[PDB]
Design an enzyme around this catalytic site. Structure first.
Site, short mmCIF file in Angstrom:
data_model
loop_
_atom_site.label_atom_id
_atom_site.label_comp_id
_atom_site.label_asym_id
_atom_site.label_seq_id
_atom_site.Cartn_x
_atom_site.Cartn_y
_atom_site.Cartn_z
N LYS A 1 42.63 23.19 42.54
CA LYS A 1 42.60 22.93 41.10
C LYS A 1 42.53 21.45 40.73
O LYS A 1 42.35 21.13 39.55
CB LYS A 1 43.72 23.68 40.37
CG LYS A 1 43.34 25.15 40.19
CD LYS A 1 44.51 26.02 39.82
CE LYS A 1 44.03 27.30 39.16
NZ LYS A 1 43.17 28.17 40.01
N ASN B 1 47.47 39.74 44.93
CA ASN B 1 48.30 38.66 44.40
C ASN B 1 49.70 38.63 45.01
O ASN B 1 50.70 38.84 44.31
CB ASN B 1 48.37 38.75 42.87
CG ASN B 1 47.23 38.03 42.20
OD1 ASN B 1 46.88 36.90 42.57
ND2 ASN B 1 46.64 38.67 41.18
N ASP C 1 37.45 34.10 33.47
CA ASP C 1 37.73 33.17 32.38
C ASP C 1 36.59 33.02 31.36
O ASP C 1 36.58 32.06 30.58
CB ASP C 1 38.10 31.78 32.94
CG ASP C 1 36.92 31.09 33.62
OD1 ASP C 1 36.02 31.80 34.13
OD2 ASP C 1 36.88 29.84 33.64
N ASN D 1 46.11 35.92 47.89
CA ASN D 1 46.33 34.73 47.09
C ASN D 1 47.73 34.21 47.46
O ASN D 1 48.73 34.88 47.21
CB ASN D 1 46.22 35.10 45.59
CG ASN D 1 46.23 33.89 44.67
OD1 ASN D 1 45.93 32.79 45.09
ND2 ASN D 1 46.59 34.10 43.42
C1 LIG Z 1 40.75 38.31 40.42
C2 LIG Z 1 42.17 37.77 40.31
C3 LIG Z 1 42.34 36.81 39.14
C4 LIG Z 1 43.78 36.26 39.15
O1 LIG Z 1 44.64 36.75 39.89
N1 LIG Z 1 43.99 35.23 38.32
C5 LIG Z 1 45.29 34.50 38.15
C6 LIG Z 1 46.43 35.42 37.66
N2 LIG Z 1 46.45 35.85 36.40
O2 LIG Z 1 47.51 36.63 35.98
C7 LIG Z 1 47.61 36.74 34.60
O3 LIG Z 1 48.58 37.33 34.11
N3 LIG Z 1 46.64 36.16 33.86
C8 LIG Z 1 46.44 36.18 32.52
C9 LIG Z 1 47.30 36.83 31.61
C10 LIG Z 1 47.02 36.84 30.24
C11 LIG Z 1 45.87 36.20 29.75
C12 LIG Z 1 45.00 35.57 30.64
C13 LIG Z 1 45.29 35.57 32.01
O4 LIG Z 1 47.47 35.80 38.47
C14 LIG Z 1 47.77 35.06 39.64
C15 LIG Z 1 49.30 35.18 39.85
O5 LIG Z 1 50.01 34.39 38.90
C16 LIG Z 1 47.20 33.65 39.54
O6 LIG Z 1 47.57 32.94 40.74
C17 LIG Z 1 45.69 33.75 39.43
O7 LIG Z 1 45.11 32.46 39.43
#
Ligand SMILES: CCCC(=O)N[C@H]1/C(=N/OC(=O)Nc2ccccc2)O[C@H](CO)[C@@H](O)[C@@H]1O
Ligand SMILES: [Ca+2]
Length: 578
Positions: A155, A328, A232, A361
């Site tokens: 990042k 995750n 995103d 992840n």
């Molecule tokens: C295809 C997987 C995408 C993903 O897991 N994105 C993020 C992720 N996003 O989780 C969310 O809750 N994201 C979110 C919630 C509300 C609005 C927008 C995003 O979860 C992980 C654990 O925290 C992060 O490490 C990731 O970067």
């Protein structure tokens, strides 16, 4: 053997690594594999090669007909290391190195290959990005554990995200990436370069081949695998026809025009069941229109979830291909005050045919992540033989041989997330949980607690302090120790608090009790100091440890024992831990 081979016959005899050997195939086998082999020894015939090599002709019917498969044999007269392809021979050698102990080899015969096509790590967590050196270390660890996939995306690297994705890497950064790519190549890992354009991309010819041109530039730098992220993306960019059309264009103009492109993957805007519109048609549309050679990433039923047969059916039916699973865990970027060092479990072990990929992840703690990473490597290579607990122990013994018992002790009590925004939990302290529970039930009603459970708890605390102090001073894996040091300090302080509280339970007399009570208050305050001063971050600042079973046991035992004292001596000692 980790991961465990698909097929293994052990002959119960043991041979010496040859003092003198005849090396057949060294000039035509995978150079990455030959390199490892020559490192392992400084006459008896040893044959190394891929199916079709002259050197392994004799054994080609024994070589499994699977991508990344291999045949390995050790006996009295010869050693055979024979892959179905180049990577497979490299994988033969990773197993061979694990067989070789104190200059001695067992007589064995192995037929192996992975049940899941793509296996490895996505660098997709929030928090302090990994360092350059952390990544070189991760890459080598993936090779040893036959993980074939690394999805890059630090990042603090702006050239894969809006808006500098359009712009090429600067000289000095480029060369670093180039070093990652080279090390990945050497260890048989697909360096997968992920682009995150979603924030500022338009559906027009211009952005369309700025992306192409960018991919081409990445190609010149040695990149052979690619991912495009739409998680995103906003507005018109959430159109699955438009997404399909862009990716198919990338496939048609680039992935299919180049000789040696391996993976092409996309992350959908609907990447788990609960973020999927039941009335909409996002995933079926995507699944109908996306070229069949392009993977679709998926996290399962929720952002954080373990993959089930029902879960994988539900998605596979819609994208009309086996989902490419993004798991995750052990990512802790939403419980940043916890370390997640527990076993890897929960994922169904019969559904290998239903998934194209499986990637974890990890945490912002690169080294501490190796426990889960090793376990995932083992699960994804041979799910049907996957042993959660044994694989955890092997990972720990691999990562920290000099202090394995100490790391196990530590990790056993650092596995639960505590309560959180995704409702995701792991088990913790299972070993002493029944002893804890009994003691707590009994003691709370002035009904005698078992002496044996008191002793178990005493024993635990003593062992925690030894583990904590050994870990602090361990120099076999300094990067690991640097990551966990704040938690180790807090874990020790927890063990001390527990010891003093148990001396309060055994309250000898009024004076001694108050001494113990004052020491616990002082110890609480040191815990608070660490929690206010280490691991500060806007989201979950600080350091929590032993939170599921052990710290509540101590808090409650303390609250209870103070209550009894206030009653008996008419005192008003503070009974809180808050
Ligand atoms: C295809 C997987 C995408 C993903 O897991 N994105 C993020 C992720 N996003 O989780 C969310 O809750 N994201 C979110 C919630 C509300 C609005 C927008 C995003 O979860 C992980 C654990 O925290 C992060 O490490 C990731 O970067
Ligand atoms: Ca060859």
């Amino acid at each position: 053997l980790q991961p465990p081979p698909q097929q293994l016959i052990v002959q119960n005899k043991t041979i010496d690594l040859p003092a003198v050997y005849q090396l057949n195939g060294g000039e035509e086998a995978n150079p990455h594999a030959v390199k490892v082999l020559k490192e392992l020894l400084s006459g008896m015939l040893i044959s190394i090669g891929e199916k079709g090599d002259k050197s392994v002709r004799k054994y080609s019917r024994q070589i499994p007909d699977h991508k990344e498969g291999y045949y390995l044999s050790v006996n009295e007269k010869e050693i055979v290391l024979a892959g179905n392809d180049e990577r497979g021979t490299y994988y033969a050698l990773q197993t061979f190195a694990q067989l070789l102990k104190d200059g001695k080899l067992p007589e064995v015969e192995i037929k192996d290959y992975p049940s899941v096509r793509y296996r490895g790590v996505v660098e997709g967590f929030y928090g302090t990005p990994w360092s350059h050196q952390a990544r070189l270390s991760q890459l080598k660890f993936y090779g040893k554990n036959k993980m074939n996939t690394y999805i890059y995306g630090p990042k603090d690297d702006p050239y894969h995200s809006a808006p500098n994705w359009r712009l090429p890497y600067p000289d000095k950064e480029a060369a670093q990436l180039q070093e990652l790519v080279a090390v990945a190549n050497e260890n048989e890992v697909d360096f997968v370069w992920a682009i995150h354009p979603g924030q500022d991309i338009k559906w027009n010819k211009e952005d369309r081949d700025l992306l192409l041109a960018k991919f081409e530039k990445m190609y010149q730098l040695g990149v052979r695998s690619f991912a495009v992220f739409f998680d995103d993306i906003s507005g018109e960019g959430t159109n699955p026809q438009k997404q399909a059309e862009l990716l198919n264009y990338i496939d048609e103009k680039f992935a299919q025009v180049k000789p040696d492109i391996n993976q092409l993957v996309m992350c959908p805007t609907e990447y788990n069941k609960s973020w999927s519109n039941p009335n909409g048609n996002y995933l079926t549309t995507l699944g109908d229109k996306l070229n069949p050679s392009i993977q679709i990433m998926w996290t399962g039923d929720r952002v954080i979830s373990d993959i089930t047969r029902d879960g994988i059916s539900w998605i596979n039916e819609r994208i009309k291909r086996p989902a490419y699973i993004w798991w995750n865990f052990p990512v802790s970027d939403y419980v940043r005050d916890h370390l997640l060092l527990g076993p890897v479990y929960g994922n169904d072990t019969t559904i290998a045919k239903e998934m194209s990929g499986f990637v974890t992840n990890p945490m912002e703690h690169a080294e501490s992540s190796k426990i889960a990473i090793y376990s995932v490597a083992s699960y994804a290579w041979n799910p049907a033989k996957y042993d959660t607990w044994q694989t955890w122990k092997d990972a720990i013994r691999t990562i920290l041989p000099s202090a394995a018992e100490e790391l196990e002790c530590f990790a056993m009590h650092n596995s639960d997330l505590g309560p959180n925004g995704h409702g995701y939990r792991r088990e913790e302290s299972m070993d002493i949980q029944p002893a804890a529970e009994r003691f707590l039930k009994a003691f709370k009603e002035g009904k005698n607690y078992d002496k044996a459970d008191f002793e178990t708890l005493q024993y635990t605390f003593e062992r925690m302090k030894e583990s904590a102090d050994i870990l602090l001073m361990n120099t076999e894996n300094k990067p690991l120790i640097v990551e966990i040091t704040p938690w180790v300090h807090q874990f020790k302080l927890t063990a001390e608090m527990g010891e003093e509280v148990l001396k309060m339970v055994e309250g000898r007399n009024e004076s001694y009790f108050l001494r113990k009570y004052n020491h616990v208050k002082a110890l609480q305050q040191q815990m608070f100091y660490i929690d206010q001063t280490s691991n500060q971050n806007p989201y979950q600042p600080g350091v929590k440890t032993a939170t599921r079973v052990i710290k509540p046991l101590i808090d409650r035992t303390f609250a209870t024992v103070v209550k009894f004292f206030n009653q008996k001596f008419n005192a008003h000692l503070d009974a809180t831990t808050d």
